[PDB]
């Protein structure tokens, strides 16, 4: 039933029912308060007077007449002020004449809408008829002019919106605008082709180079899934090239439940694609790019854990600024085969390998490695011991030798090390408010016979990073060619402060120094934290009878609140290679750097982010940054400007500037240069849906 609270109603039985005096229509679930009403039983309609303040489930509508039809719910109001609500989000609209077509279809003419609340609305998209539909989430908006502030900032004769959470094909995903050498701008045009695959062409300009066409594809199937990013630009204006490009590829394939086959690819045109129009992380993992292919295996499920994979790799190394590249080797085949099983207590670990390194500036030559190790373990209740008996067996075959390099070699180096150390636990030397103090000693002793293996070339071996964990490794040169001959007794002691209620580490110490069969060095470290604030991380690498110190480092970082961070970090070291001089001998010099970071709200509504990486060896900062973010009531601003002046070459500095604009419930967050100072939590609106939100209901 639909009861009316009006005391007096002019009507005989059915033809007309006229009610006045702030009447109501029950219609369970939809209140309807108005001023007066008239009926006429000809099309079963309802007119709701002059004020018409409806309110049903969070959408207060205030119109003029609202001539409903109520047979298929065809309504027609005036001056509607629609404010729909929903869990987490909302919309506001001031239309001139709302319509209604059947169910879930509107024709809302002459609007002025925003996702913001009432008042001097910071922004709104005034327009003509907006035919929002529910069967298709495509709300056309004829003659829409995006206003901001008090002046229109845009204009179109036709526009669409994704009215729900679907994958909107054909939407031009926003824009990216920011630069120094020009005003380099790019506008992507995503256009979905099928549920599985969707290429996104993005035309662009650089303002100083030319025009780019960086687009990408991204497919998917039951088994094969991959992406294919790329870029290309015709004749350049500042450098002089004409056809530069870049390509990427993933294609993670599956054959049958055991064999993957992934193709990791990356290739640029010249030795200067990065460092020209790329970010500040071109420093690492971008001096030599990757190109791979691999397979796999695994199982046998019966006293075995086989694995394999025939990798084929050939890096692409870039020059720095004048054409000086190192160009490491290239692995054409690689027939790895690992193993692992357990004999109850003992633990057999076997291996194998094969690799042909092809090169031009240096000699080629296949090889082979068999490392059948066996490591028993014994931990009774307190302290562990674990011996081991391996047998390293290399065998080279190098051809086209230019100088002196034995045509065929072969070695066997029986590796025998005995790792094991006890453990102590104590509660009497605690420092805090109820912590538990653990002190733990341990040892190591590895025996490896000696040989003369310096006439064999250095294909892939490299000396390992000397730290605390280094004392407990059975190979200094962490590779395969050079295996040192050692007879040492690394001695260590490490202490962990563990909480009195749970077992979260609060602080960890340690120190160790490997003997010989003496000292030649010292290694200490300490890293912990009293929680969120007063975090600390340090290290050292001392050597006595020779000099003061090799490579000490220090750290810090205190968080007063969820933001307000002030992280800082030092780093020292002598004889550190810098910039790869002409011949190939790296410039050797001593480091002294101190990077400072912060993100400290300067004003109730303005935050700041700052980075600064100083270098005392030359009295010039390596990298520096400065930003500023904003917020308001309707996400009116959500504006962030970020400026960075990094270094690219030995001398070539190159600055840049960035912009970011955010509106409530229609934007996106994530477009940042790289992973900067630790947290850098954004200081503006979530902005999930990126357009038109998700809900539309009467």
């Amino acid at each position, epitope marked *: 039933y639909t009861r009316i609270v009006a005391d007096r109603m002019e009507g005989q039985s059915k033809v007309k029912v006229r009610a006045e005096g702030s009447v109501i229509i029950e219609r369970d679930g939809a209140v309807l308060n108005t001023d007066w009403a008239d009926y006429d039983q000809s099309g079963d309609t309802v007119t709701v007077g002059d004020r018409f303040a409806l309110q049903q489930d969070g959408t207060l509508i205030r119109g003029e007449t609202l001539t409903y039809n109520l047979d298929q719910q065809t309504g027609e109001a005036h001056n509607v002020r629609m404010e729909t609500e929903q869990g987490g989000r909302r919309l506001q609209s001031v239309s001139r004449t709302a319509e209604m077509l059947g169910e879930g279809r509107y024709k809302l003419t002459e609007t002025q809408f925003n996702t913001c609340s009432a008042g001097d609305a910071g922004w709104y998209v005034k327009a003509a008829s907006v035919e929002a539909d529910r069967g298709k989430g495509i709300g056309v908006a004829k003659h829409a*002019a995006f206003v901001f502030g008090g002046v*229109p900032l845009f204009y179109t*004769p036709w526009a669409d919106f994704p009215l729900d959470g679907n994958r909107k094909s054909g939407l031009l995903v926003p824009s990216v605008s920011a630069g120094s050498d020009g005003v380099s701008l790019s506008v992507p045009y995503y256009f979905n082709l099928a549920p599985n695959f969707d290429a996104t062409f993005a035309p662009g300009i650089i303002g100083e180079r030319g025009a780019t066409f960086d687009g990408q594809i991204r497919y998917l199937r039951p088994d094969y899934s991959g992406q294919t990013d790329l870029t290309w630009l015709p004749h350049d204006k500042k450098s002089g090239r004409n056809n530069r490009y870049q390509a990427k590829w993933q294609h993670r394939h599956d054959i049958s439940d055991t064999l993957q086959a992934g193709v990791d690819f990356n290739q640029v045109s010249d030795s200067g694609y990065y460092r020209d129009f790329y970010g500040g992380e071109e420093i690492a993992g971008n001096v030599n790019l990757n190109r791979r292919v691999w397979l796999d295996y695994g199982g046998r499920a019966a006293g075995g854990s086989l694995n394999a994979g025939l990798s084929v790799q050939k890096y692409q190394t870039l020059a720095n600024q004048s054409g000086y590249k190192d160009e490491p080797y290239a692995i054409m085949p690689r027939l790895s085969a690992d193993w692992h099983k357990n004999a109850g207590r003992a633990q057999i670990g076997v291996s194998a390998q094969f690799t042909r390194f092809s090169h031009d500036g240096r000699q080629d030559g296949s090889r082979l490695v068999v490392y059948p190790g066996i490591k028993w373990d014994f931990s009774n209740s307190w302290g562990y011991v674990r011996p081991k008996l391996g047998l390293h067996a290399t065998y080279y075959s190098l051809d086209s030798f230019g100088g002196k390099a034995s045509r065929s070699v072969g070695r066997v180096l029986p590796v025998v090390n005995i790792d094991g150390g006890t453990t102590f636990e104590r509660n009497t030397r605690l420092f805090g408010g109820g912590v538990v103090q653990t002190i733990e000693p341990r040892l190591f002793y590895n025996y490896i016979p000696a040989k003369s293996q310096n006439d064999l070339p250095n294909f892939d071996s490299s000396e390992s990073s000397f730290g605390y964990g280094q004392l407990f490794r059975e190979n200094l040169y962490y590779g395969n060619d050079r295996i040192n001959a050692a007879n040492s007794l690394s001695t260590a002691v490490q202490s962990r402060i563990l909480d009195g209620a749970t077992g979260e580490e609060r602080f960890r110490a340690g120190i160790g120094q490997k003997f010989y069969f003496s000292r030649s060095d010292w290694v200490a470290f300490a890293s912990g934290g009293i929680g969120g604030r007063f975090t600390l991380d340090s290290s050292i690498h001392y050597n006595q009878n020779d000099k003061r110190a090799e490579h000490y480092a220090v750290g810090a970082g205190y968080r007063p609140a969820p933001g307000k961070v002030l992280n800082a970090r030092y780093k020292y070291g002598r004889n550190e290679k810098i910039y790869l001089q002409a011949d190939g001998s790296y410039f050797y010099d001593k480091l002294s750097q101190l990077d400072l970071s912060a993100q400290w709200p300067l004003t109730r509504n303005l935050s700041a982010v700052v980075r600064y990486n100083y270098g005392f060896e030359a009295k010039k900062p390596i990298e520096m940054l400065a930003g500023a973010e904003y917020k308001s009531s309707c996400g009116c601003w959500g504006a962030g400007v970020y400026a960075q002046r990094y270094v690219t070459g030995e001398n070539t500095y190159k600055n840049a500037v960035f912009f970011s604009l955010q509106l409530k419930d229609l934007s996106s967050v994530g477009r940042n240069p790289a992973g900067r100072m630790d947290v850098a939590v954004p200081g503006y609106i979530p902005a999930h849906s990126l357009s038109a939100g998700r809900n539309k209901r009467p």
Partner: nanobody
Amino acid sequence: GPSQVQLVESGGGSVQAGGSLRLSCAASGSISSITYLGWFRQAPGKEREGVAALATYYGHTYYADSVKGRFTVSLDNAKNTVYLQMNSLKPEDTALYYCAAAYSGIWTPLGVWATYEYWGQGTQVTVPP
């Protein structure tokens, strides 16, 4: 049926080194609610975007970087013909003047980026030194 072109450049300017005149690009039949044009300066030997631009409906006008406080494109939808009123005219401006006769394009303070249907006949604004 959308292949018709009806944009003859009516009106004319006959002034010397300094002066002002109103020129038009008459159009018929088509609704001008979404259809608007930008005035073009075409010197003899060069073709380019002009000193003015008007978008219809809301009626916002970009103008050009070259002209400041000089020529204002003015709405004349009661005339069916749009009018450009020149001011402080100079001989450097002598050229053939056209209209963009476009149908669909975006408008920004940077400029109306619509480049379609160049139906303008072209009228030589006559200005001697």
